[PDB]
C-alpha cells in the first residue's frame, strides 16, 4: 500500500553558519576561481 | 496505492548565512572568477 | 494508484543570507567573471 | 503495508558554525580555486 | 506490515564548529585548492 520515501542527498534542518573575514594587511595578490563571502 | 516520494539533493529547511567581510587594507589586486558577498 | 512526487535539486524552505562587505582600503585592481553583493 | 524510508547522504539537524578570519599581514599572494569565508 | 528505514551516510543531530585563523605573519605565499574559512 502506501509507502513514503524522503532521498536527500544533503539535509539541512536547522543552520547558522557565520563567517568573519578581515584583512588589516597592505600588499596581498590572489587568483580566485570562485570565491563566496572572503577578502583578498 | 499511494506512494509519496520527496527526493532533493540539497534540502535546507532552516539556515542563517553570515558573512562579513571588512578589509581595512591597501594595494590588492586579484582575479576572481565568480564572487559573492566579498571584498578585493 | 496516487502517487505523489517532488524532485526539486535545490530545496530551500527558509534562509537568511547576510552578507557585509566593506572595503576602507585604497589602490586595488581586479578583473572579475562574475560578481553578487561584492566590493572591489 | 507502510513503508517509511528516509535515506539521505549528509544529515544536519543543528549546526553552528563560526569561522574567523584576520589577517593583520602584509604580502601574501595565492592561487586558490575555490574560497568560502577566507582572506587572502 | 510497516517498515520504517532511516540510513544517512552522515548525521549530526548537534554541532558547533569555532575555527578561528589569525594570520598576524608577513611574506606567506600559498597554492589552496579549495578553502573554507582560512588565511593565507
Chains 1, 2, 3, 4, 5 share one sequence.
Do not use: C, T
Request: hydrophobic fraction near 40%.
Amino acid at each position: 500500500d502506501a509507502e513514503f520515501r524522503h532521498d536527500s542527498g544533503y539535509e539541512v534542518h536547522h543552520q547558522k553558519l557565520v563567517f568573519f573575514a578581515e584583512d588589516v594587511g597592505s600588499n596581498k595578490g590572489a587568483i580566485i576561481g570562485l570565491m563566496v563571502g572572503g577578502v583578498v
